[PDB]
């Protein structure tokens, strides 16, 4: 305890996406690093670019080790995402703050029992508008999905005027909201 790192409930992997139209979507997805302690998280976060600084067309994804940050994964294919859409003003005011909060919600296991329903999260840096999402494992788990949206919204400090939607990945890959908070 004067010398032991603070362990996380999960080992997490940080992924980076840079668009290269000559490659398949999946091939553009590169593992940055894995970590399983609070100290090791900050070490990685402190040395990497803020999302607000990435070239447009890039993502970060943070996923539980063993879960690939893509629809296709077993843990993702029946799942969906809580989506925060940001406008261009929010890149400045909210993107990096919201992304770090989302990271801390994941590594700290902030959704009680339903943190096991969390797969990971992704930040899309886009010229038309940035997005942050939390991916959950099963769009049919009404109580899980719904408790996660609620706590997450509180964590981001979004006002009651803002409404966020949950979309299944089935729909996204073929988008309507299954739930809002």
């Amino acid at each position: 305890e004067h010398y032991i790192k603070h362990p996380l409930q999960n080992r997490w992997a940080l992924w980076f996406f840079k668009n290269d139209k000559s490659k398949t979507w999946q091939a553009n997805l590169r593992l940055i690093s894995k970590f399983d302690t609070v100290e090791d998280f900050w070490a990685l976060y402190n040395h990497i670019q803020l999302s607000s600084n990435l070239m447009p067309g890039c993502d970060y994804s943070l996923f539980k080790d063993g879960i690939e940050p893509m629809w296709e994964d077993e843990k993702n294919k029946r799942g969906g995402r809580w989506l925060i859409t940001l406008n261009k003003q929010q890149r400045r005011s909210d993107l990096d703050r919201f992304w770090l909060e989302t990271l801390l919600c994941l590594i700290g296991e902030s959704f009680d029992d339903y943190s096991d329903d969390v797969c990971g999260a992704v930040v899309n840096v886009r010229a038309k508008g940035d997005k942050i999402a939390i991916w959950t494992t099963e769009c049919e788990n009404r109580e899980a999905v719904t408790h996660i949206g609620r706590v997450y919204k509180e964590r981001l400090g979004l006002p009651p005027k803002i409404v966020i939607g949950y979309q299944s990945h089935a729909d996204t890959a073929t988008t309507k909201n299954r739930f809002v908070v």
Binding site: P7, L8, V38, W42, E101, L104, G108
Partner: peptide
């Protein structure tokens, strides 16, 4: 079940 407070995790950043 290992849970961490936002305030605890922030205190660790340096």
């Amino acid at each position: 079940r290992i849970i961490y407070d936002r305030k605890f995790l922030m205190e660790c950043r340096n």
